[PDB]
């Protein structure tokens, strides 16, 4: 029997184009580009013919296909984009069965407790050396597949390690004073606790809210203030900021200002309610989904690759041109790019062992009750990988992208598949190079970049990260920010109102009674680069103007001050875009005797004002707890247990357990396994163009080969010799 072609293909997620003049259907789904004419006994998949027992049937203007059409066509094998991995890569993320296995093991322990939750269940990484031997020498990793299982027992954190290969518990270690991150059920609990609160309902009523059932809460970490906030350091708490649901799908546009509840999660109750001046809730409808807008007409534009892609995805390994890397997912930080090599005329040279987002923070600068403690450590306290936002095909990624699914463990230990978790796409990026010598034939080649894109949404903000692989060896890392602004309710409608001046001291008036409170977006990337080997050194090249001592008319010259940076303490610094910072390999040189290196550029530009550091006085606790915010460049000695700029357990942390801690012993960085950390941020002063919803704003970072190669990397294969 048969099924309706359009409805089915759409369900399946494929793009369907019908050409009435050619009597042809063009279907696109990831690596598959298909053409099929009604009644034809064959279809075309990526330029190759595929026989069809049951042809597409056109009946009274509707197309119908066999119930096996989707599988016969899309899983035929003519689309070679994906290939089966034969020997499992040691860095492959835990499978669904491994996740379940790890959970059964801890649950089999005499200490496991019933309400125990899982903040993170991830692969315990094999030793770096073996992983490289597997990637470069294909040597098997004879070390048991293990898993780190971080558990939250009520409010207590416990770390356990399970031996997946032998199915047994290796360690069970409680971690004192550590608080666990915010888990999904905490959101529902806060909403429910607020809904059952008699006092809160009364506080809300005096603030002009009739139906307390329309109040939407949002859970926020309280941070640490040495008690000045009057909060017990031992309790598992969350502060709650509320908004009113007016039915326009954007409760964020209706803040109930100056009302903050403090909820104790173990106690399941509001332990404190801070109330400030009453501010009338902004009620005007401000939808961002277009319900009240006209859909403008736009002509179609598609980027197509009719014969398939230039890259191949074997299991989780991606091969594209000279690049080879492994791509996996972690529930905390998202995507992890591993064992990155660049094939230099037959030899795979190491570039990066492991790269991923280290952590990020969005701190506010308003001192009022509903804002003084507001600082979001999105990955650390919320879990960005778990909050991945499925890619909206053709909108969040170009129409020629391939969308990957990724699996991780939810907070109850059950496997979870995030659909369209990461997008992979090749794109035209202008001329790779060009030279039009006068009177001679032109010379130009196009530039191609391979992009790996991932989006994660935490509350009101959506963040986009692109890991950009340039064909010429350069690696770009861009961070985009969009979503809905966290706003403050104010009495002024315009800057001509009496309280205007005071209402906008900490932010711009972006709408009537609405202020986009100033804040920063600070991202940090953990890049374990291994420049053509493990042992590297940090080198500084500062371009300078020096007096001319060679004679002739010039008074000055352009020279460079080159010097090594021998320790972690001196490597932690601000980044001057006018200078050059290299991670060199003092053991290997290019054809000219120069050390093979990678130039590190933590600041390659951005569309919002740039954050010069943390916009906090040096005596602020957030400033003290999180030193990674104030420096753009950090370099530490490799250690398998140092992966977060903000530290492993940042919720209500009392001291820097991150980059401040990783560099405190000021170790030597001379000819050793170094790990680069790049911090780049923006200082967001709002404007009306960003409300009700903000247009994506981007920040760029870059890693460029510096004398890593001996000539223009994309000139091509040498014809003679």
**Residue bearing tokens 């916009």:** 615
Considering the complex, what minimum distance in angstroms separates the CB of residue 354 from Ca ion?
Answer: 9
Per CB under 5 A, the list member of 186, 264, 646, 673 interacting with Ca ion is 673
| 394-405 burial code (b ≥16 CB/10 A, e <16) | eebbbbbbbbbe
Question: Binder to its own copies among 557, 561, 654, 666 (CB under 8 A)?
Answer: 557
Handedness of CA 347, 86, 75, 316 (dihedral sign): negative
- Three-state secondary structure call for residue 688: helix
Q: Check residue 95 for interaction with its own copies (CB under 8 A).
A: no
Q: Which residue lies nearer to its own copies by CB, 84 or 592? A: 592
Judged by CB, which is closer to its own copies: 42, or 167?
Answer: 42
Burial of 60: CB neighbours in 10 Å, binned 0-12, 13-18, 19+: exposed
Q: Does 344 bind its own copies (CB under 8 A)?
A: no
- Least Cβ distance, residue 219 to Cu ion (angstroms): 19
- Does residue 575 touch its own copies according to CB under 8 A? no
Which of 117, 128, 309, 349: binder of its own copies (CB under 8 A)?
309
- Minimum distance between the CB of residue 706 and its own copies, rounded to whole angstroms? 5
**Tokens 């780049």 sit at which residue?**
680
Closest to 582 (Cα-Cα) out of 631, 632, 660, 635: 635
Tokens of 146: 């293990």
Q: Which stretch binds Ca ion (CB under 5 A): 93-101, 115-123, 372-380, 637-645?
A: 637-645
Out of its own copies, Cu ion, Ca ion, none, what residue 704 binds, judged by CB under 5 to 8 A for its kind, is its own copies
**667 contact, one of Ca ion, its own copies, Cu ion, none, CB 5-8 Å limit per kind:** Ca ion
Of the residues 108, 202, 271, 715, which one makes contact with its own copies according to CB under 8 A: 715
Q: One symbol per residue from 676 to 705: x for binding Cu ion (CB under 5 A), - otherwise; what is it?
A: --------x---------------------
d(CA 130, CA 259): 54
Q: Is residue 35 a contact residue for Cu ion (CB under 5 A)?
A: no
Residue 530 interacts with which of Cu ion, Ca ion, its own copies, none, CB < 5 to 8 Å by class: Ca ion
354 interacts with Ca ion by CB under 5 A: no
* Residue 365 binds which entry of its own copies, Cu ion, Ca ion, none, CB below 5-8 Å type-dependent: its own copies
Tell me the closest approach of the beta carbon of residue 684 to Cu ion, in angstroms. Answer: 4
Q: DSSP for 564-593?
A: E--BHHHHSB---TTSEEEEEEEEEE-TTS
Q: Is 125 exposed, middle or buried (0-12, 13-18, 19+ CB in 10 A)?
A: middle
- Considering only 436, 561, 654, 666, the residue that binds its own copies (CB under 8 A) is 436
Nearer to its own copies, 92 or 474 (CB): 474
Residues 6+ apart with CB under 8 A from 608: 481, 521, 682, 683, 684, 697, 699
Q: Which two tokens stand for residue 44?
A: 């075309």
Q: Is 188 in the site for its own copies (CB under 8 A)?
A: no
Backbone torsions φ then ψ of 30, nearest 5 degrees: 60, -125
**Would you count residue 661 as binding its own copies (CB under 8 A)?**
no
User: Does 667 engage in binding with Ca ion (CB under 5 A)?
Assistant: yes
- Contact stretch for its own copies (CB under 8 A) within 97-105, 106-114, 445-453, 670-678: 445-453
The 443-458 sheet, strands edge to edge: 402-409, 415-435, 443-458, 461-470, 475-483
User: Could you say which of 200, 465, 506, 662 contacts its own copies (CB under 8 A)?
Assistant: 506
Cα–Cα distance measured from residue 180 to residue 266, given in angstroms and rounded to the nearest whole number: 12
Residue 528 touches which member of Cu ion, its own copies, Ca ion, none, C-beta under 5-8 Å by kind: Ca ion
- Does 275 sit near its own copies (CB under 8 A)? no
CB hemisphere CA count around 390 (13 angstroms)? 10
User: How far apart are CB 16 and its own copies at their closest, in Å?
Assistant: 15
Residue 371: how many CA atoms within 13 Å on its side-chain side? 22
Token output for 704: 């460029």
Burial of 321 (0-12, 13-18, 19+ CB in 10 A): middle
Positions 305 through 324 that interact with Cu ion (CB under 5 A) = none
Q: Select the binding partner of residue 455 from Cu ion, Ca ion, its own copies, none (C-beta < 5 to 8 A, by kind).
A: its own copies
Whole-number minimum distance, CB 630 to Ca ion, in Å? 18
Would you give the binding string for its own copies spanning residues 190-229, x where CB under 8 A is met? -----------------------------------x--xx
In the list Cu ion, its own copies, Ca ion, none, the entry touching 637 (Cβ below 5 to 8 angstroms by class) is Ca ion
- Taking the C-alpha atoms of residue 714 and residue 558, their distance in angstroms, rounded to an integer, is 29
Interface pattern 507-526 for Cu ion (x via CB under 5 A):
--------------------
Binding to its own copies in span 57-86, by CB under 8 A: none
Chosen from its own copies, Ca ion, Cu ion, none, partner binding at 439 (C-beta under 5 to 8 Å by type): none
Select from 405, 594, 654, 668 the one that contacts its own copies (CB under 8 A): 594
For residue 71, CA distances in Å to 1, 295, 405, 417, 515 come to: 15, 35, 18, 21, 52
Q: How far are the Cα atoms of 330, 400, 633 from residue 476, in angstroms, in the given order?
A: 21, 20, 16
Residue from 75, 428, 561, 655 in contact with its own copies (CB under 8 A): 428
- Which listed residue (61, 115, 494, 563) binds its own copies by CB under 8 A? 494
Is the CB of residue 428 less than 8 Å from the CB of residue 444? no
Partner that binds at residue 27, options its own copies, Ca ion, Cu ion, none, CB closer than 5 to 8 Å by kind: none
The yes or no reply on residue 530 touching Ca ion (CB under 5 A) is: yes
Report the alpha-carbon distance of residue 524 to residue 629 in Å, rounded: 8
Alpha carbon distances (Å) from 574 to 5, 526, 603, 660 = 58, 16, 10, 14
In whole angstroms, what is the distance from residue 478 CA to residue 467 CA? 7
Q: Which is nearer to Ca ion, 181 or 674 (CB)?
A: 674
**Using CB under 5 A as the criterion, which residues of the chain lie in contact with Cu ion when the complex forms?**
684
Binding site for Ca ion (CB under 5 A): 528, 530, 636-637, 662, 665, 667, 673-674
């Amino acid at each position: 029997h048969m099924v309706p072609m359009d409805k089915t293909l759409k369900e399946f997620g494929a793009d369907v184009q019908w050409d009435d003049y050619a009597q042809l259907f063009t279907l696109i789904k990831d690596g598959a580009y298909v053409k099929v004419k009604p009644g034809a006994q064959t279809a075309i998949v990526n330029g190759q013919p595929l026989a069809l027992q049951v042809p597409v049937v056109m009946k009274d203007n509707k197309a119908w296909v066999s119930d096996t059409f989707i599988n016969d066509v899309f899983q035929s094998g003519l689309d070679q984009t994906f290939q089966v991995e034969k020997r499992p890569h040691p860095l492959n993320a835990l499978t669904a069965d491994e996740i379940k296995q790890a959970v059964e093991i801890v649950k089999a322990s005499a200490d496991f407790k019933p309400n125990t939750r899982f903040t993170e269940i991830s692969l315990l990484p094999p030793d770096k050396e073996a992983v490289w031997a597997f990637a470069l020498e294909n040597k098997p990793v004879d070390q048991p597949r293990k898993a780190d299982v971080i558990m939250l027992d009520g409010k207590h954190i416990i770390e356990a390690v399970v031996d997946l290969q032998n199915n047994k518990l290796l360690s069970w270690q409680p971690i004192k004073d550590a608080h666990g991150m915010v888990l999904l059920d905490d959101f529902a609990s806060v909403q429910n606790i607020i809904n059952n609160s008699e006092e809160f309902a009364a506080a809300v009523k005096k603030r002009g809210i009739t139906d307390a059932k329309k109040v939407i809460t949002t859970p926020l970490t309280v941070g640490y203030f040495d008690g000045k906030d009057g909060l017990k350091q031992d309790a598992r708490l969350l502060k709650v900021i509320s908004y009113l649901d007016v039915g326009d799908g954007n409760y964020w546009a209706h803040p109930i200002e100056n009302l903050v509840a403090v909820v104790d999660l173990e106690q399941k109750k509001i332990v404190k309610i801070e109330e400030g001046p009453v501010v009338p809730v902004p009620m005007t409808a401000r939808p961002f989904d277009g319900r009240d807008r006209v859909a403008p007409a736009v002509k179609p534009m598609q980027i197509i690759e009719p014969e398939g892609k230039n890259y191949t995805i074997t299991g989780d390994m991606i091969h594209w041109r000279n690049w080879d890397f492994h791509l996996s997912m972690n529930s905390r930080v998202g995507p992890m790019i591993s064992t990155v090599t660049y094939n230099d005329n037959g030899t795979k040279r190491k570039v990066m062992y492991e790269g991923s987002l280290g952590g990020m923070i969005v701190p506010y600068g308003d001192p009022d009750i509903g804002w003084y403690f507001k600082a979001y450590l999105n990955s650390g306290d919320y879990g960005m990988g778990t909050l991945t936002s499925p890619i909206a095909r053709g909108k969040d990624a170009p129409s020629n992208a391939v969308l990957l699914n990724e699996t991780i463990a939810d907070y109850t230990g059950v496997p979870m598949e995030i659909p369209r978790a990461i997008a992979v796409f090749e794109r035209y990026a202008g001329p790779e190079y060009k030279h039009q010598e006068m009177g001679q034939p032109n010379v130009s080649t196009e530039r191609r970049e391979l992009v790996v894109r991932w989006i994660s949404t935490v509350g009101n903000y959506d963040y986009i990260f692109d890991w950009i692989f340039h064909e010429n060896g350069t690696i770009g890392i861009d961070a985009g920010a969009t979503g809905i602004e966290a706003v403050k309710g104010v009495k002024a409608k315009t800057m001509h109102d009496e309280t205007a001046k005071d209402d906008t001291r900490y932010g711009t008036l972006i709408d009537h009674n609405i202020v986009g409170t100033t804040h920063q977006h600070i991202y940090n990337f953990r890049l374990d680069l291994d420049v053509d080997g493990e042992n590297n050194s940090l080198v500084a090249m500062d371009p300078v103007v020096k007096p001319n001592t060679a004679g002739g008319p010039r008074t000055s010259t352009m020279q460079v001050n080159q010097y090594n940076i021998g320790n972690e303490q001196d490597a932690a610094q601000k980044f001057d875009p006018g200078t050059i910072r290299l991670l060199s390999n003092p053991n290997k040189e290019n054809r000219m005797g120069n050390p093979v290196s990678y130039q590190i550029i933590p600041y390659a530009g951005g569309t919002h004002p740039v954050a010069k550091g943390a916009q906090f006085a040096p005596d602020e606790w957030i400033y003290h707890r999180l030193s990674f915010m104030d420096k753009q460049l950090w370099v530490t000695r490799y250690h398998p247990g140092e992966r977060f700029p903000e530290g492993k357990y940042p919720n209500r942390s009392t001291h820097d357990t991150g980059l401040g801690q990783y560099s405190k012993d000021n170790e030597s960085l001379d000819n050793t396994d170094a790990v680069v950390w790049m911090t780049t941020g923006t200082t967001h002063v709002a404007r009306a163009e960003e409300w009700p919803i903000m247009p994506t704003e981007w920040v760029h970072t870059l890693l460029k080969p510096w004398n890593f190669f001996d000539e223009t990397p994309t000139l091509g294969a040498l014809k003679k010799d």
